[PDB]
Amino acid sequence: TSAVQQKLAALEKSSGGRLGVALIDTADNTQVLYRGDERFPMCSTSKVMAAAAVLKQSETQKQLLNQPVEIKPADLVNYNPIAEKHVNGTMTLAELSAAALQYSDNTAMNKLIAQLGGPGGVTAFARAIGDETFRLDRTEPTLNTAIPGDPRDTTTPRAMAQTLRQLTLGHALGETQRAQLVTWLKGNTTGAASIRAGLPTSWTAGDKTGSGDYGTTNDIAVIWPQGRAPLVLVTYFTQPQQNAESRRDVLASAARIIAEGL
Numbered sequence: 001t002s003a004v005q006q007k008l009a010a011l012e013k014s015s016g017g018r019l020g021v022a023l024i025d026t027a028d029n030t031q032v033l034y035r036g037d038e039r040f041p042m043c044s045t046s047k048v049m050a051a052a053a054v055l056k057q058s059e060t061q062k063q064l065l066n067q068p069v070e071i072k073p074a075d076l077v078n079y080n081p082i083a084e085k086h087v088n089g090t091m092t093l094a095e096l097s098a099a100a101l102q103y104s105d106n107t108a109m110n111k112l113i114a115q116l117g118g119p120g121g122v123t124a125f126a127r128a129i130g131d132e133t134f135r136l137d138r139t140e141p142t143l144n145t146a147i148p149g150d151p152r153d154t155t156t157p158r159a160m161a162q163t164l165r166q167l168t169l170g171h172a173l174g175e176t177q178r179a180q181l182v183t184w185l186k187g188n189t190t191g192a193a194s195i196r197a198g199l200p201t202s203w204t205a206g207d208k209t210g211s212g213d214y215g216t217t218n219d220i221a222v223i224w225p226q227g228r229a230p231l232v233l234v235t236y237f238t239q240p241q242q243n244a245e246s247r248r249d250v251l252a253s254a255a256r257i258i259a260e261g262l
């Protein structure tokens, strides 16, 4: 047990919930894990895997991101800030990917999942890039039920950090596609209160947040510290009661502990 792990344990104890953290520092490829091999509900952090899977498809179909997808009134789910503007029309796969990643649009995610042949198609892509832990079982919104002990729609912090590293900094995607994913993540609108709130302001980052029942509050980030090689950081958090409040501040606190420990 490390000093950073003990600080994370104290944060967890004061939070009332269960915290999972995985850091990869690409300066030396070392890792800091806290409950790194425990499963957590991914919620909208799973949108990264779906968008990446569509990017991979686009490597053999140059025009795929320009392909239209019909948005019908019946398609709208519980959080559709972009898709609601386009009902009875179409959005391209690029537009859907940007909406899913940067606005956390749940209808957009469902269209990505459908383009991959269902939740299992997203899982298949995870396996193809070496992630043997990730599982997507359901569509939006039920993938956010986040029931304690339920393996559906879960991963571990260790696995998600590795995957995010391979996707954004490694060679899981072609260069153009990797750059597009990074561009999308860096343009996220939802992240200022989560991991990035705990980082020095001079640093830059891209991230994808998630939230669900059981006060589940998540964030996954690729981070460029000032004068340092990039980091990948996953912070997952979930609580014992179904109607628990979101705790983005806990993710910010975890990130600050990690940053102060470098």
Ligand SMILES: O=C1c2ccccc2C(=O)N1CCc1nnn[nH]1
Pocket: 044, 078, 079, 104, 105, 106, 144, 190, 209, 210, 211, 212
């Ligand atoms: O922001 C929400 C939200 C609020 C209330 C109920 C359900 C949802 C919901 O699904 N999303 C989008 C998903 C999300 N992304 N980052 N945190 N939550």
